[PDB]
Design a binder for these strands. Structure first.
Lengths: 150, 80, 97, 29, 188, 139
RNA sequence: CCCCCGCCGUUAGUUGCCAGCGGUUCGGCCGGGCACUCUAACGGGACUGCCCGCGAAAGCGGGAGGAAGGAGGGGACGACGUCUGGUCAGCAUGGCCCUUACGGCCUGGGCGACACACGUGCUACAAUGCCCACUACAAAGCGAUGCCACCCGGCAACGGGGAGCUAAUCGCAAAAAGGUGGGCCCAGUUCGGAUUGGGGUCUGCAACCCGACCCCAUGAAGCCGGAAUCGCUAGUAAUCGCGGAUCAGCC
């Protein structure tokens, strides 16, 4: 596709690769620093509001957000039917992370000088401890679309 | 708006305008590309046509008008 | 304190040239500083190929690395004699303080 | 410039060449 | 040279070359190297017929060299005038080109003139050679002519070809026709 | 004794001087944290931690850094500490530089040992950025 | 095969730094020292060479080391030809045409007009933000009437005075994004700066037509854009500031 999967250096605070990916999703204009800060501050936000350790909260969020099945269009003899299909494990992560950041940006709450609260709140809302929020919606909606046209 | 201590005015029209001064004035116009020039009193009463770039517009210059540029009198852009 | 600047396109043309000057002056002055290298700077110039004239439209990119060599000679005397007639290689442009 | 007299754009230093063109031309051979 | 008069110093060289090409044509100009220090420039014109340049007992070399001084005053500084013979004019692309350019002026069959030149060049030394004629062949519709022998291949590719190149023009009643001569020699 | 390592990245040079000690870092006089304040990025002393029992609590570093930017410096210093660590002992510096800190078949683990050759990049013509190409429109 | 950029080493040290010591008008200024950066010349390094997997082979995938890879990144090298491609307005040149003028000088105007249409862009609609303050990292360039240190008068543009530089040794220069602290509190707003009124600086003979800059007031549309459509595969896109050519000044 775009290119071969490049391996990402694990996170400085918690040496989790998945985290860095998330951070990359947040960052824009290569402002890697602001991006890391927002995620870290959110993690701190996750600590206070929620007793649980942030790393666990985030991972659980991504799980709720990953779509198992997605619908892809295809041209049949008549009309382009939307064929439902599985999603690559690689694909699911990129979608989940992307959707979180997008929904997070979606939130009204403008907290912290930046975005940092929206990420914090979004992740918790995602958790399935709380499996709500805009991110999960998209995920649920896609799956629903699939198997509709089973 | 003060450009500098000495008001600039290109010599093409100045030298030309002033010569007209001793005879009197010059009937008919003058025509100069030098919209850049500021107008001085000797200019007054005269009718200098300025260059739109398209054409030269007759501009009678009166006293209230002196400090100005002359170009200010000939508009480059037309709604047409 | 005669500072000598030797510049050239070819690294060898200087090594030869500047080296000669070292040996000669050894005869009538102090003992030279020894050919000091002075790093080579490369210049990239993007310009009109010709000077104002034909083909202003033209361009082109050039890179010309130029080499330097000082070898200073303090306490001068009949250094000048041994130096003046003695030079060799073209391809070298030497200027002295 | 000096040689060709193309005014359009001669480098001062050479102050020669038709312009860049002759500069490049002379340089070329 | 000097920042101030590198250009000035340069203009003179063109000035010198200007006269030499005009005069020395019969001699067979190949190249005019110009080396310089202060008021003493080298200028060593290379020629096929050194005789034509020198003159008898060196009479012409005197006039030309003197002419040079008029153009090169003390400020330009007196200049010398060395002349070296071109070993085998047949090797000089410039000459080979000029050679063909002349015949064309005569109105010789261009294609043949080309063959001959490649042959001469090919004939004495030269690992490879190629000649190109512009258009308006025989005052005809513009065309192009070729001809080549030996490996110009392994040349053209920049890697140390040592291919002499030369172009010669040809004014004609019909029009100008450029000539290109490529000669391949042992590479580096 | 002291150990040395240079380290340059983008355009930056960092002199890294390791000395057995507390583990503090004096960069350009300020404390490592001081020169670096609020930079999540500053994982210059990553090569130290990688040694095993993190070298730090058994090392000390005086560093001079000039040229480029704080990010570039972070990389240069990171390389410095990576290289010096090797000189002190071949063993410690492992796979990126020597053994585990040292080298790999293909992908770079950290590959602290290498000097990132990446430089800004000249702007090619016909393109705005160098790489970035202008987009097309229906026009 | 050649050039520029990536890593390492030798040679060379008036570039460089207490790296390391003594002094200081504590400016690397002084002695001293080539280590380092660097300067420029040469040498090393990458070849699917090594390890696992498939293959008949070429090679494809993966992994280690490594600054770097499987053409590491950018040039020179844009083939024979195509488009009756583009330019007689850069210059050159055949033919045709004008010669009190289809030439030449000048002043002024025009190339800057507008009911409208399109292309390329800038700024923006904001809180991952705007403003004020404090504080930190860059590269490549340019400088003789030219860059302008520092001091003074001015809110300021800028003016007066004046040191050094002839430019790795002085100046442009402040780097901006960034980090720290404060303000704003979701509003067409401490968003956004169009537009317009006034005052004024500067270049230049001269800024009406028709310059840029400063300060006060004004404070528009714009709350993320229909159909349709463009760029870019990594230090790339995105984002931030810095220099240059042209050049009195400057759109």
């Amino acid at each position: 596709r775009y290119a071969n999967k490049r391996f990402r250096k694990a996170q400085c605070p918690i040496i989790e690769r998945l985290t860095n990916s998330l951070m990359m999703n947040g960052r824009n204009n290569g402002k890697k620093l602001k991006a890391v800060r927002i995620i870290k501050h959110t993690l701190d936000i996750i600590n206070v509001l929620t007793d649980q350790n942030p790393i666990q909260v985030v991972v659980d969020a991504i799980t709720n957000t990953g779509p198992r099945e997605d619908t892809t269009r295809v041209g049949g003899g008549g009309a382009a039917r939307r064929q439902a299909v599985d999603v690559s494990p690689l694909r699911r992560v990129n979608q989940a992370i992307a959707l979180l950041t997008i929904g997070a940006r979606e939130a009204a709450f403008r907290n912290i000088k930046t975005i940092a609260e929206t990420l914090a709140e979004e992740l918790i809302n995602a958790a399935k401890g709380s499996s709500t929020s805009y991110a999960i919606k998209k995920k649920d909606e896609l799956e629903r679309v699939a198997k509709s046209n089973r | 708006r003060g450009m500098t201590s000495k008001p600039a005015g290109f010599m093409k029209k100045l030298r030309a305008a002033k010569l007209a001064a001793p005879e009197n004035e010059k009937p008919a116009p003058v025509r100069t590309h030098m919209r850049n020039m500021i107008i001085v009193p000797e200019m007054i009463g005269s009718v200098v046509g300025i260059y739109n770039g398209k054409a030269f517009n007759q501009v009678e210059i009166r006293p209230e008008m002196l400090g100005h540029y002359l170009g200010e009198f000939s508009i480059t852009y037309t709604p047409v | 304190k005669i500072r000598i600047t030797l510049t050239s396109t070819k690294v060898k043309q200087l090594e030869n040239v500047s080296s000669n000057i070292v040996k000669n002056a050894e005869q009538h002055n102090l003992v030279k500083k020894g050919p000091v290298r002075l790093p080579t700077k490369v210049l990239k110039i993007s310009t009109r190929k010709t000077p104002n004239g034909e083909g202003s439209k033209t361009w082109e990119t050039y890179e010309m690395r130029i080499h330097k060599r000082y070898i200073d000679l303090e306490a001068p005397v009949q250094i000048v004699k041994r130096i003046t007639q003695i030079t060799i290689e073209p391809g070298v442009d030497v200027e002295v303080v | 410039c000096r040689v060709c007299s193309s005014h359009t754009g001669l480098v001062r230093k050479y102050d020669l060449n038709i312009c860049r063109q002759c500069f490049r031309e002379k340089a070329n051979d | 040279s000097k920042k101030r008069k590198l250009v000035a110093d340069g203009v003179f060289y063109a000035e010198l070359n200007e006269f030499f090409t005009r005069e020395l044509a019969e001699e067979g100009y190949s190249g005019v190297e110009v080396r310089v220090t202060p008021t003493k420039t080298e200028v060593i014109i290379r020629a096929t017929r050194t005789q034509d340049v020198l003159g008898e007992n060196g009479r012409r070399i005197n006039e030309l060299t003197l002419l040079v001084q008029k153009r090169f005053k003390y400020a330009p500084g007196t200049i010398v005038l060395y002349a070296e013979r071109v070993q085998d004019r047949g090797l000089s692309a410039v000459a080979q080109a000029e050679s063909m350019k002349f015949k064309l002026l005569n109105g010789l069959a261009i294609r043949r003139a080309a063959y001959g030149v490649v042959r001469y060049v090919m004939e004495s030394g030269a690992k490879g050679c190629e000649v190109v004629v512009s258009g308006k062949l025989r005052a005809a519709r513009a065309k192009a002519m070729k001809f080549a022998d030996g490996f110009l291949i392994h040349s053209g590719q920049p890697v140390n070809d040592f291919i002499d190149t030369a172009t010669r023009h040809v004014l004609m009643r019909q029009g100008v026709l450029g000539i290109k001569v490529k000669i391949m020699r042992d590479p580096a | 004794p002291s150990v040395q390592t240079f380290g340059k990245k983008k355009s930056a040079t960092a002199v890294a001087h390791v000395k057995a000690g507390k583990g503090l870092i004096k960069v350009n006089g300020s404390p490592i944290t001081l020169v670096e304040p609020e930079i999540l990025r500053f994982k210059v002393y990553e090569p130290l931690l990688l040694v095993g029992l993190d070298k730090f609590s058994n090392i000390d570093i005086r560093v001079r850094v000039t040229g480029g930017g704080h990010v570039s410096q972070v990389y240069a210093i990171r390389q410095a500490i990576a290289k010096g660590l090797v000189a002190y002992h071949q063993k410690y510096v492992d796979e990126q530089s020597k053994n585990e800190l040292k080298k790999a078949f293909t992908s770079y683990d950290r590959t602290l040992l290498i000097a990132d050759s990446r430089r800004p990049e000249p702007k090619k013509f016909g393109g705005k950025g160098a790489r970035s190409r202008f987009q097309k429109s229906y026009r």
